[PDB]
């Protein structure tokens, strides 16, 4: 039943056709569970780790991978029968950096959390229900709970369906429903129905919803839905079918491995066209083993050196890094990736209370009657001192101290204010700090009242834990409380009845205190006290209260502000029913109108700043509060998201004037909207949604279960830490100090990080894109295999790896903040600079294949055809006459590929410095900057020589160490990469586009 909370008790009786005190019968048992199925959300989505190791593999890259190992593995079986053992080294470390992969892939999802998951935490075990096989009540499985039940509840039980209550058994029934929204005030509860079908949870005030708790009483009710069609339900499926976009740099590496797929296979194409002359080869000899060895042995490495093994490592160590950096400036990142989305942010959507401000509130102005004549007019105006909820503090008037129990309407405007509240304050030792028992706001009226003696009550000399209520228990010691009218939305008041105690204050008999939004409860007053006195609300005097109400809460005070009055003449007890808030409005009018009270929530100390910040980096900055829309816009004003005299007819909006918007304004309303007034959560996925629209990246805040669905939605979920277990897991980000300022902070560093994460990915696939040319050298020149796959694999992980590590830790740019937001669909490598990586792979290709032709050809440890004849290499078995009266198994030798290897390593060096900075020169920006860097730099050489010396590693490696002399044309051939780019950065900045 949708519509069980504007349905009577006997209306919902009848639709089920069910007895409340009998209940349903086995038959109806089972027709109730086949149409509506068990109260539960649905099993969770299922994996395993045959279909986890299998995800490992469907990536791409990691696909190639697979199958160079597998090729490897069988040239490692044909090669020869007593070359090299070391011919099983090759396939055999493929697989490891596979399974290493596999590995971390899977205790990454062994430790991941997931959010509809968490919401089965508010499922209780158990319910209670009466059926027709027994009178009493049983205990049975909230699963096997139905629509249509009678169901049981009392103090501490979760609630297990979405509950119609039919009869309140104790005297009053309340309900802890701060899992949905986070204010934890328990609510009252009634039984008659609430006539809009179209109404919102928080005005349900006769329904029970699953997962909320019973603070206080004992009910009886029906159930009006179950698992999925509960309130919980109905976000476990908002949750569970919105979808996560791709990061847009995963977005770009999945881009990346797939023309890097399409890559590969033009080279092998083109490595066959210009080995067609082989076609032209006579048909008996040469060894088809061996060109078919030769073809594949190169395919081989071709895999390894396109692609940046080492990188998914590198980008998650600097995440994680990133990640611990960021804890200690307040924020808790959740999954990796998201830190960069999070610096691509361009429009935040912030909660106020908690977050902008300190949810910390007390009263600051106030005013009472002092005089009425006619049409003049005089209020009684004053202030307050002190901000925290600790009664130090005094009441002044135009600055002067005063004594305020000279003031007749000053002691009323007390007693209202003590009595017509529901916290109050209990003194922490432990802390030596004033906290608040209940409502912040209303602590901030219970603090009031302490500040103004109004019985100039000797409390000079009180001990804390005592003076925590010592001026509100004398105004407890002259009325007795008989019962209290709950603050409901439609009346926006609250209010008391009470009897004084004793017999000699015995006088007036019995009152009504109220409290309330200052339009309805002056609406209801006929009367206006000035003093002691009393006196017919008029035009003039209403005009100078609701004139100063605007002020106060439209002016750069911002004060959030309450009417207080009173009842003077009750209705008679017994002509009071108690059990139905339809008639509470009722039963406070005709009141008489005792003062006004403004209180404020202030901002933070740093939110002025942050927003400031937000200015400088082209983020827009949107408010969502409570605050009626005229004091919203003020506090927008007051934090800097309006300017004080800027015109903003259409930049703010009420969740009402939302709605009667058609769905074409509602889009374009969001394009310039900065604050938004009393939603309805709904309104927040719609917000989104729109923003998403414009290609916006949005940031929202969000606290308790019904804030999840929006949370899951926006590109970064930001949570509270004194938010609900639920939000966090739904959330990409967690503030655990609630602050603004840290989201501000958190874009900052998320963009310090992608601009260093910026040069690492430029660093490792620009060596790759090298290592690959010198592949294909090799095999259109026709050379002996110049880098052997094993040491490439070296090179990715380990020698490359830790000068990319070191790039994470480039200093930030003094500007990171005065600049806009980055495009998602920014290329990494584009226009003049992939002309630039271009022309740097094309060298190193170069470099790398000369240093072992060098070795073979012009140098003094191999003789080598200086005619080039060297090329016909795999014909030297055979042809020992043409021009080749010398050995043979020297174009296996270990020295000419170190020569290769070794100039790849020290190229890659000069090309880590030359990462530092895209187009700045080492002359305007020393190396030395990154010092971490120089540092990692040191390291990979020592493991060059350490697999150069070491005896058992050289032979892995085919590899041998070089002399001072080879050493000295490593350098020649290599240091002349820094210069060849200082000059292509000079060409970047004195003569292109910038
Ligand atoms: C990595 C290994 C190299 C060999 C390679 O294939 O990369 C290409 C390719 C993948 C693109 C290119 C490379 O293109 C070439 O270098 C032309 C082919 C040369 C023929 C070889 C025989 C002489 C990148 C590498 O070239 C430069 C010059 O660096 C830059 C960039 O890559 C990035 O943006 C990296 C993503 C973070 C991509 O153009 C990229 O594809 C696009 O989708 C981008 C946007 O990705
Ligand atoms: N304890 C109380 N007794 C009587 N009226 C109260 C009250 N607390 C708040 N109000 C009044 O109720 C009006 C409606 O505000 P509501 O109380 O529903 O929201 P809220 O202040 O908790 C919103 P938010 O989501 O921003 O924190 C306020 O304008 C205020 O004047
Ligand atoms: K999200
Ligand atoms: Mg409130």
Same mark, same amino acid.
């Given at each position: 039943?949708?519509?069980?909370?504007?349905?009577?008790?006997?209306?919902?009786?009848?639709?089920?056709?069910?007895?409340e005190?009998?209940?349903?019968?086995?038959?109806?048992?089972?027709?109730?569970l086949?149409?509506?199925?068990?109260?539960?959300?649905?099993?969770?989505?299922?994996?395993?780790?045959?279909?986890?190791?299998?995800?490992?593999?469907?990536?791409?890259?990691?696909?190639?991978?697979?199958?160079?190992?597998?090729?490897?593995?069988?040239?490692?079986?044909?090669?020869?029968? *007593?070359?090299?053992?070391?011919?099983?080294?090759?396939?055999?470390?493929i697989?490891?950096?596979?399974?290493?992969?596999?590995?971390?892939?899977?205790?990454?999802?062994?430790?991941?959390?997931?959010?509809?998951?968490?919401?089965?935490?508010? *499922?209780?075990?158990?319910?209670?229900?009466?059926?027709?096989?027994?009178?009493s009540?049983?205990?049975?499985?909230?699963?096997?709970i139905?629509?249509?039940?009678?169901?049981?509840?009392?103090?501490?039980?979760?609630?297990?369906?979405?509950?119609?209550?039919?009869?309140? &058994?104790?005297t009053?029934?309340?309900?802890?429903?701060?899992?949905?929204?986070?204010?934890?005030?328990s609510?009252?509860?009634?039984?008659?129905?609430?006539?809009?079908?179209?109404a919102?949870?928080?005005?349900?005030?006769?329904?029970?919803?699953?997962?909320?708790?019973?603070?206080?009483?004992?009910?009886?009710?029906?159930?009006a839905?179950?698992?999925?069609?509960?309130?919980?339900?109905?976000?476990?499926?908002?949750?569970?079918?919105?979808?996560?976009?791709?990061?847009?740099?995963?977005? &770009?590496?999945?881009?990346?491995?797939?023309?890097?797929?399409?890559?590969?296979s033009?080279?092998?194409?083109?490595?066959?066209?210009?080995?067609?002359?082989?076609?032209?080869?006579?048909?008996?000899?040469?060894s088809?083993?061996?060109?078919?060895?030769?073809? /594949?042995?190169?395919?081989?490495?071709?895999?390894?050196?396109?692609?940046?093994?080492?990188?998914?490592?590198?980008?998650?160590?600097?995440?994680?890094?990133?990640?611990?950096?960021?804890?200690?400036?307040?924020?808790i990142?959740?999954?990796?990736?998201?830190?960069?989305?999070?610096?691509?942010?361009?429009?935040?959507?912030?909660?106020?209370?908690?977050?902008?401000?300190?949810?910390?509130?007390?009263?600051?102005?106030?005013?009472?009657?002092?005089?009425?004549?006619?049409? /003049?007019?005089?209020?009684?105006?004053?202030?307050?001192?002190?901000?925290?909820?600790?009664?130090?503090?005094?009441?002044?008037?135009?600055?002067?101290?005063?004594?305020?129990?000279?003031?007749?309407?000053?002691?009323?405007l007390?007693?209202?204010?003590?009595?017509?509240?529901?916290?109050?304050?209990?003194?922490?030792?432990? &802390?030596?700090?004033?906290?608040?028992?209940?409502?912040?706001?209303?602590?901030?009226?219970?603090?009031?009242?302490?500040?103004?003696?109004?019985?100039?009550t000797?409390?000079?000399?009180?001990?804390?834990?005592?003076?925590?209520?010592?001026?509100?228990?004398?105004?407890?010691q002259?009325?007795?409380?008989?019962?209290?009218?709950?603050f409901?939305?439609?009346? @926006?008041?609250?209010?008391?009845?009470?009897?004084?105690?004793?017999?000699?204050?015995?006088?007036?008999?019995?009152?009504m /205190?109220?409290?309330?939004?200052?339009?309805?409860?002056?609406?209801?007053?006929?009367?206006?006290?000035?003093?002691?006195?009393?006196?017919?609300?008029?035009?003039?005097?209403?005009?100078?209260?609701?004139?100063v109400?605007?002020?106060?809460?439209?002016?750069?005070?911002?004060?959030?502000?309450?009417?207080?009055?009173?009842?003077d003449?009750?209705?008679?007890?017994?002509?009071?029913?108690?059990?139905?808030?339809?008639?509470?409005?009722?039963?406070e009018?005709?009141?008489?109108?005792?003062?006004?009270?403004?209180?404020?929530?202030?901002?933070?100390?740093?939110?002025?700043?942050?927003?400031?910040?937000?200015?400088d980096? !082209?983020?827009?900055?949107?408010?969502?509060?409570?605050?009626?829309? !005229?004091?919203?816009?003020?506090?927008?004003?007051?934090?800097?998201?309006?300017?004080?005299?800027? *015109?903003?007819?259409?930049?703010?909006?009420?969740?009402?004037?939302?709605?009667?918007?058609?769905?074409?304004?509602?889009?374009?309303?969001?394009?310039?909207?900065?604050?938004?007034?009393?939603?309805?959560?709904?309104?927040?996925?719609?917000?989104?949604?729109?923003?998403?629209?414009?290609?916006?990246?949005?940031?929202?805040?969000?606290?308790?279960?019904?804030?999840?669905?929006?949370?899951?939605?926006?590109?970064?979920?930001?949570?509270?830490?004194?938010?609900?277990?639920?939000?966090?897991?739904?959330?990409?980000?967690?503030?655990?100090?609630?602050?603004?300022?840290?989201?501000?902070?958190?874009?900052?560093?998320?963009?310090?990080?992608?601009?260093?994460?910026?040069?690492?990915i430029?660093?490792?696939?620009?060596?790759?894109?090298?290592?690959?040319?010198?592949?294909?050298?090799?095999?259109?020149?026709?050379?002996?295999?110049?880098?052997?796959?094993?040491?490439?694999?070296?090179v990715?992980?380990?020698?490359?790896?830790?000068?990319?590590?070191?790039?994470?830790?480039?200093?930030?740019?003094?500007?990171?903040?005065?600049?806009?937001?980055?495009?998602?669909?920014?290329?990494?490598?584009?226009?003049?600079?992939?002309?630039?990586?271009?022309?740097?792979?094309?060298?190193?290709?170069?470099?790398?294949?000369?240093?072992?032709?060098?070795?073979?050809?012009?140098?003094?440890?191999?003789?080598?055809?200086?005619?080039?004849?060297?090329?016909?290499?795999?014909?030297?078995?055979?042809?020992?006459?043409?021009?080749?009266?010398?050995?043979?198994?020297?174009?296996?030798?270990?020295?000419?590929?170190?020569?290769?290897?070794?100039?790849?390593?020290?190229?890659?060096?000069?090309?880590?410095?030359?990462?530092?900075?895209?187009?700045?020169?080492?002359?305007?920006?020393?190396?030395?900057?990154?010092?971490?860097?120089?540092?990692?730099?040191?390291?990979?050489?020592?493991?060059?020589?350490?697999?150069?010396?070491?005896?058992?590693?050289?032979?892995?490696? @085919?590899?041998?160490?070089?002399?001072?002399?080879?050493?000295?044309?490593?350098?020649?051939?290599?240091?002349?990469?820094?210069?060849?780019?200082?000059?292509?950065?000079?060409?970047?900045?004195?003569?292109?586009?910038?």
């Open positions: 039943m949708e519509a069980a909370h504007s349905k009577s008790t006997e209306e919902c009786l009848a639709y089920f056709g069910v007895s005190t009998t209940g349903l019968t086995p038959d109806q048992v089972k027709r109730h086949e149409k509506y199925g068990h109260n539960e959300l649905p099993a969770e989505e299922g994996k395993s780790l045959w279909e986890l190791v299998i995800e490992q593999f469907e990536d791409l890259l990691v696909r190639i991978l697979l199958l160079a190992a597998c090729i490897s593995f069988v040239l490692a079986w044909f090669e020869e029968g *007593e070359e090299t053992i070391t011919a099983f080294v090759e396939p055999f470390v697989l490891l950096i596979l399974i290493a992969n596999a590995i971390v892939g899977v205790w990454q999802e062994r430790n991941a959390e997931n959010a509809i998951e968490a919401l089965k935490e508010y *499922e209780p075990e158990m319910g209670k229900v009466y059926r027709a096989d027994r009178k009540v049983q205990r049975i499985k909230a699963r096997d139905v629509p249509g039940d009678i169901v049981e509840v009392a103090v501490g039980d979760k609630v297990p369906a979405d509950i119609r209550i039919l009869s309140i &058994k104790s009053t029934l309340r309900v802890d429903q701060s899992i949905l929204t986070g204010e934890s005030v609510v009252i509860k009634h039984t008659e129905p609430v006539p809009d079908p179209r919102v949870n928080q005005d349900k005030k006769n329904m029970l919803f699953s997962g909320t708790n019973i603070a206080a009483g004992k009910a009886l009710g029906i159930v839905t179950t698992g999925v069609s509960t309130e919980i339900g109905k976000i476990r499926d908002q949750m569970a079918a919105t979808e996560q976009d791709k990061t847009p740099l995963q977005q &770009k590496l999945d881009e990346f491995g797939e023309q890097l797929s399409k890559v590969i033009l080279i092998c194409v083109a490595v066959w066209l210009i080995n067609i002359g082989h076609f032209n080869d006579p048909v008996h000899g040469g088809w083993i061996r060109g078919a060895i030769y073809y /594949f042995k190169i395919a081989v490495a071709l895999a390894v050196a396109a692609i940046p093994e080492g990188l998914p490592a590198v980008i998650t160590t600097c995440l994680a890094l990133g990640t611990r950096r960021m804890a200690k400036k307040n924020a990142v959740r999954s990796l990736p998201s830190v960069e989305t999070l610096g691509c942010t361009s429009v935040i959507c912030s909660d106020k209370t908690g977050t902008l401000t300190t949810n910390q509130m007390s009263v600051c102005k106030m005013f009472i009657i002092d005089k009425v004549d006619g049409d /003049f007019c005089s209020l009684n105006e004053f202030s307050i001192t002190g901000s925290t909820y600790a009664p130090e503090g005094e009441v002044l008037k135009n600055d002067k101290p005063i004594r305020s129990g000279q003031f007749d309407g000053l002691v009323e007390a007693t209202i204010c003590a009595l017509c509240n529901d916290s109050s304050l209990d003194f922490n030792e432990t &802390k030596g700090v004033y906290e608040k028992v209940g409502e912040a706001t209303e602590t901030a009226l219970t603090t009031l009242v302490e500040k103004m003696n109004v019985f100039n000797e409390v000079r000399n009180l001990s804390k834990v005592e003076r925590a209520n010592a001026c509100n228990s004398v105004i407890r002259l009325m007795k409380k008989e019962f209290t009218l709950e409901s939305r439609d009346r @926006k008041s609250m209010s008391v009845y009470c009897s004084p105690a004793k017999s000699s204050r015995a006088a007036v008999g019995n009152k /205190f109220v409290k309330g939004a200052p339009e309805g409860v002056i609406d209801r007053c006929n009367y206006v006290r000035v003093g002691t006195t009393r006196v017919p609300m008029t035009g003039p005097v209403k005009e100078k209260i609701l004139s109400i605007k002020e106060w809460g439209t002016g750069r005070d911002t004060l959030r502000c309450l009417a207080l009055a009173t009842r003449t009750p209705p008679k007890r017994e002509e009071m029913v108690l059990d139905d808030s339809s008639r509470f409005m009722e039963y009018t005709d009141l008489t109108f005792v003062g006004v009270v403004g209180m404020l929530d202030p901002p933070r100390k740093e939110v002025m700043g942050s927003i400031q910040l937000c200015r980096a !082209g983020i827009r900055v949107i408010m969502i509060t409570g605050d009626n829309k !005229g004091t919203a816009i003020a506090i927008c004003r007051r934090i800097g998201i309006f300017g004080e005299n800027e *015109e903003v007819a259409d930049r703010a909006y009420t969740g009402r004037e939302f709605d009667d918007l058609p769905l074409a304004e509602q889009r374009e309303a969001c394009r310039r909207a900065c604050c938004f007034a009393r939603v309805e959560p709904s309104h927040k996925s719609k917000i989104v949604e729109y923003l998403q629209s414009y290609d916006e990246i949005t940031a929202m805040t969000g606290d308790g279960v019904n804030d999840a669905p929006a949370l899951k939605k926006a590109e970064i979920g930001i949570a509270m830490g004194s938010g609900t277990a639920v939000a966090k897991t739904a959330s990409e980000m967690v503030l655990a100090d609630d602050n603004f300022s840290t989201i501000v902070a958190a874009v900052e560093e998320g963009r310090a990080i992608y601009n260093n994460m910026k040069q690492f430029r660093y490792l696939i620009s060596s790759n894109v090298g290592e690959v040319v010198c592949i294909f050298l090799t095999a259109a020149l026709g050379l002996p295999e110049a880098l052997i796959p094993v040491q490439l694999l070296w990715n992980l380990v020698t490359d790896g830790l000068p990319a590590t070191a790039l994470g830790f480039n200093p930030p740019d003094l500007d990171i903040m005065d600049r806009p937001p980055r495009s998602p669909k920014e290329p990494l490598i584009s226009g003049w600079l992939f002309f630039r990586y271009m022309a740097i792979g094309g060298y190193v290709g170069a470099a790398t294949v000369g240093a072992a032709a060098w070795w073979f050809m012009y140098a003094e440890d191999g003789p080598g055809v200086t005619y080039h004849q060297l090329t016909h290499f795999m014909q030297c078995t055979e042809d020992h006459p043409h021009f080749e009266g010398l050995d043979c198994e020297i174009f296996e030798a270990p020295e000419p590929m170190t020569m290769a290897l070794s100039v790849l390593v020290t190229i890659e060096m000069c090309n880590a410095l030359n990462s530092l900075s895209e187009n700045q020169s080492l002359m305007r920006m020393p190396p030395w900057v990154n010092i971490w860097l120089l540092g990692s730099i040191c390291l990979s050489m020592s493991l060059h020589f350490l697999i150069l010396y070491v005896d058992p590693l050289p032979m892995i490696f @085919k590899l041998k160490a070089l002399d001072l002399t080879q050493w000295l044309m490593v350098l020649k051939i290599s240091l002349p990469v820094i210069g060849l780019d200082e000059i292509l950065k000079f060409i970047a900045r004195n003569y292109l586009e910038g």
